[PDB]
Ligand binder design. Structure first.
Ligand SMILES: *[C@H](O)[C@H](C[C@@H]1CCNC1=O)NC(=O)[C@H](CC(C)C)NC(=O)OCc1ccccc1
Ligand SMILES: *[C@H](O)[C@H](C[C@@H]1CCNC1=O)NC(=O)[C@H](CC(C)C)NC(=O)OCc1ccccc1
Lengths: 302, 302
């Protein structure tokens, strides 16, 4: 038993991380087949970053201006292109460690593992949820751009995130591997708002199910509610409204515990209205919303 | 910026995980050079586990009774020995993926990454602290024994933990890689107590420093205290007593923030006596004690 925020084993991705330098700017690139993907602001000087014209900036760059290092091994760049907010550098050597992989655009409320990297070398791994407002709450310093987020399904790595920027609020934003930002963000160093940060209701319920599965049951009560009644409470508390699809997604957990979803909703409502009274649930004194139902099932079944 | 519980990249360890079967019992083994390490209760039947005589049980076992699989590849076992609570199976092939490594016995209050595994295949990675009472708060199911805990220093893997058992309280216990349990535990399926679970004071202070570094400063106050005054508060709250060595360990963080350690102690005291008033620190509504000072520095400096 026990329930912990858990990342995927990162070895398959470690073997794809490279260092990309252009001028005095260094960040990380992702090397798959004979293509290296990285954030296009690798071409900016610190001055260019306030209002970059990326087309003009790129035009002064040639292949030999992109220095790509895999370990101590330098790679030969034979082509370059800009796709949205990422550069694709064509190299002359296919990565021998390329895993089976795909590029995917995750949906808000889904989770993925971040392999935080500096100078092309992995630093650490941790789980993140793509929040409803298309931000993530990570740990990123200067030089971490190009670090990627991923999921693993048996042997296939699904890359879903590349890191680009930190907002004034301290939350983190980035793109998919086609270089389209998640959310209303642009890669320029100007103040940018993410808007209200709502709570992922179906994930809170999943984590309450995980809590019950793991012996934490004090918050259960004799009440039930309706979807429309509950959702009127979610409104007040900036929770996402619950839908039958969410109910259906919770089915396996509902059946595996014998607690109707709307009975669990009634417990959540009382927690939202009455607080936790200084108690904890799965070691936390707040309601946790960065576990998906799949996260809870995968971890409660190995 | 940002502060997250972060595990080491696990690739070096993924390449060492194998499956070990004896009879109808399967768990994980660690394959380094030509030796495979695993928990000795792989030889028990479910009945033997209530009161096993491991010497007698082992004697009925020969090399060919230990089935060791690396991926789809079966390994040939040429020798077996029992060292404390672990088996060492000698195989005829050195692991070609053996990293540079050492075996270390960690101290209570230190942290390490767990690579949770089933049937010899990595499932997920997460950070754990060895608590003062020699338990860890993990996520382990049937079949997870032999999963290991480790730290990485540039290229050297320091293995410090192998998983064996879950206590009635739901916390987790295990051995070092010489097979000596951390704590007063035995590998038998009988009720076993860990004793009082005290809080790692120096780690709470490190995390308060991490909070200040990351903009969370509301808990700072105009007061200071003394080591003996503070420790009288730690007593009431089952905190470990603070020592000058702890003060010295905190020096870099104290100097990097300009907050004297005893000023930070005074803040902790008020938090302990007055609670958090419904506020949060680094996204938490409790005081977190599973980050070491080194953890905070490593993560706030890449
Ligand atoms: C890429 O390595 C970097 C990651 C930032 C640095 C601190 N935390 C992060 O996530 N991205 C940038 O520096 C980015 C560049 C633009 C051209 C997109 N600018 C940015 O994030 O500005 C905000 C900021 C910069 C430095 C420290 C704190 C916030
Ligand atoms: C090894 O795979 C296993 C790990 C337990 C299973 C559930 N969570 C864990 O950490 N260890 C054992 O099953 C262990 C065997 C003894 C001979 C040491 N017994 C054990 O931990 O008993 C407590 C327990 C068993 C099953 C479910 C929950 C608790």
């Amino acid at each position: 038993s026990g329930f912990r925020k858990m990342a995927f084993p990162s070895g398959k991705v470690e073997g794809c991380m490279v260092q990309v330098t252009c001028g005095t700017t260094t960040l990380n690139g992702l090397w798959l087949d004979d293509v290296v993907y990285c954030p296009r602001h690798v071409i900016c000087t610190s001055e260019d970053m306030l209002n970059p014209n990326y087309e003009d900036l790129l035009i002064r760059k040639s292949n030999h201006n992109f220095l790509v290092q895999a370990g101590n091994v330098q790679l030969r760049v034979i082509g370059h292109s800009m796709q949205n907010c990422v550069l694709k550098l064509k190299v002359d050597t296919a990565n021998p460690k390329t895993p089976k992989y795909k590029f995917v655009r995750i949906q808000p409320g889904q989770t993925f593992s971040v392999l935080a990297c500096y100078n092309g070398s992995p630093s650490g791994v941790y789980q993140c949820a793509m929040r409803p407002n298309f931000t993530i709450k990570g740990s990123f310093l200067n030089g971490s751009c190009g670090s990627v987020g991923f999921n693993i399904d048996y042997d296939c790595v699904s890359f879903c995130y590349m890191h680009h920027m930190e907002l004034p609020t301290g939350v983190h934003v980035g793109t998919d591997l086609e270089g389209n930002f998640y959310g209303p963000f642009v890669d320029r160093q100007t103040a940018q708002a993410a808007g209200t940060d709502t709570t992922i209701t179906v994930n809170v319920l999943a984590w309450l199910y995980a809590a019950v599965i793991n012996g934490d049951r004090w918050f259960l009560n004799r009440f039930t509610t309706t979807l429309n009644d509950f959702n009127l409470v979610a409104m007040k508390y900036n929770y996402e409204p619950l839908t039958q699809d969410h109910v259906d997604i919770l089915g396996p957990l509902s059946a595996q515990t014998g607690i109707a979803v709307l009975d669990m909703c009634a417990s959540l409502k009382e927690l939202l209205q009455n607080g936790m009274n200084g108690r904890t649930i799965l070691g936390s004194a707040l309601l946790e919303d960065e576990f998906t139902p799949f996260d809870v099932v995968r971890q409660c079944s190995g």
